[PDB]
Amino acid sequence: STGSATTTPIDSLDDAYITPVQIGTPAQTLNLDFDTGSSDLWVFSSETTASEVDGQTIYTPSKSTTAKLLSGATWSISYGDGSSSSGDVYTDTVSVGGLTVTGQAVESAKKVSSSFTEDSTIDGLLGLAFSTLNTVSPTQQKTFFDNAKASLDSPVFTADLGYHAPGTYNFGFIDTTAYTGSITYTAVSTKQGFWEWTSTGYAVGSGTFKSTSIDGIADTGTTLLYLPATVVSAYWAQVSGAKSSSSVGGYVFPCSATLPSFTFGVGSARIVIPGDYIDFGPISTGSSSCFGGIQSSAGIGINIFGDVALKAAFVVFNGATTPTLGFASK
Template structure:
């Protein structure tokens, strides 16, 4: 049933998909051909009463966020998240960052640990073999990653309530993992860093999931682990009862250092959930049947809080039409193929063919791409240099940076050059000019490219669980 609203109301209302409109468009255009896009115009996304629920999850500022060392931190976090061995030169750089912050390398970390040989990767990996030996050793310097403040990475968080009566926690929404884990009343005080805790005993609806445990191993040898409770979880007014909540009984110090973040809410596929012996469903998977449409959108922004919308698409948040492409969920991620790229600000630039597999990951800061694309991009920046001392590609902070266009099927996603300047480094060039860390870095060593927050700040992205598709459009 349609309803009339004023133009003023439309601007703030929840805009929901007309029942079946997107599904019909998909059915009409569905093709087994990889890279085939489905265009959905704004006219197909009308204001309607559709039944089912919709909600907006606005982000909130992490008041502990710091810029210092942000580039190397983001690099190390990505290596650790996907169970990869962190390069020795990056470890040395991180040691310098720790010392500059007054943190002793290895403190609270995993020096002397047994490493992660044969580990199954992190919450973001899907059974990847991990790194033989990991980075842990009897050398204290090898344990340093676990002690670096997580505040460098999670600039914005989102509010989630758990339990009865509801307890509000700020969590990091992550489309590259599938666990909902939190600091809790079971977390040792020595591993707490001022986080708001999930008080299990205070919730009348909490019940232990007998025999269930979780253990997320990272590429630096550190880990987070604990047991599992079923409890009521709400985000933006949508409630899931008996949601698996992973209670941390042991936490890597990299998470303990961030007082503002109480944990993680994973939004990837159920298959890579780390609960044993039986993987548990994500919040989104459990909530899908009650949503007006089985999807959520990510509208992340630069230097300000963005939002996630569940069950509806807000047409005021993007320009033009949405371009949908099939997601490959075999490995548990929102994975897709990109066909090529171009560098520069011309809208008519020719796309250079460079096929590569990628995942859409809001839990990774940087944009990790194949060397051929990264080298082509920085080849257009006069002062750019791949610096071991800085941990990756850097350039003068006053450089005017070109756009990077990435072809996703027939859709060309433009990543604005202004978003490629991640943060200042401690490095200066020969003239004394400040150097900044690049937002795009090499994906060498990763099993796929990672389209992280640098990409999301230019693109409005739809994660359609019902059709296992991704939709892209330029931000409004």
């Protein structure tokens, strides 16, 4: 089997991407944030604290004839940006772009943190990291991909994120019309539960390529590109007026600037992020200071190839016995 669904930026900045997901019988369609950096499928629901719901579409398990409470199971998760959610668990039928999984763990939120409440466009998350990170207790649950894998034509899914435009998540096949040149595959470590790999280096604008190993994760659920301070300093040094602001929380630059591109290495191959991709607009409405899309990972503890990097490529998440990651220009 296969699946194919369109993913759409939630706002003019590509802060995140939502993908329609059918849950239950009859289908309840929720717009979920597909996240290759976590492994929980959780949704706003009829059980979510009323004061913490503000415009989201909710899952109502009582209205699904295929919903079953997973007796005694609970979940609780905290993300890298400080946000969090928790609740209990149902199993139900979940379909993504024509691909159907029965008995999927659907984690129902009783509580969500303010940032989730404040984002009316995201009805929940669908985790696509390795199931070892799943937070369901006392019986850990599998991801949608994990549950689908045996059925898929090929044990893969692909991320084709658009820049200020819709894109595509495919399951079970590689669309050879969706990229240019060839796909370059690189090794993955599953030891931290992430799609963790090692970039071969970087370049700033038309500058010479620096060969250097950068260990990081392919994470569709993170907006920006987080890299070592040395690398990020070298990028912003090429932008007149750019500086790191502790008060704003990262590198900012004059909105009148023209940003240089950023290249990262995948084996012998190169992915080029155009400068426009690195512009996240005024730090506050009407300000002439703009927030940078490449930031230091020094505070985080890991490097993150977030949407800024991934949307410049066609990305293959290969879930074979020995998983790998593939990158192509597009």
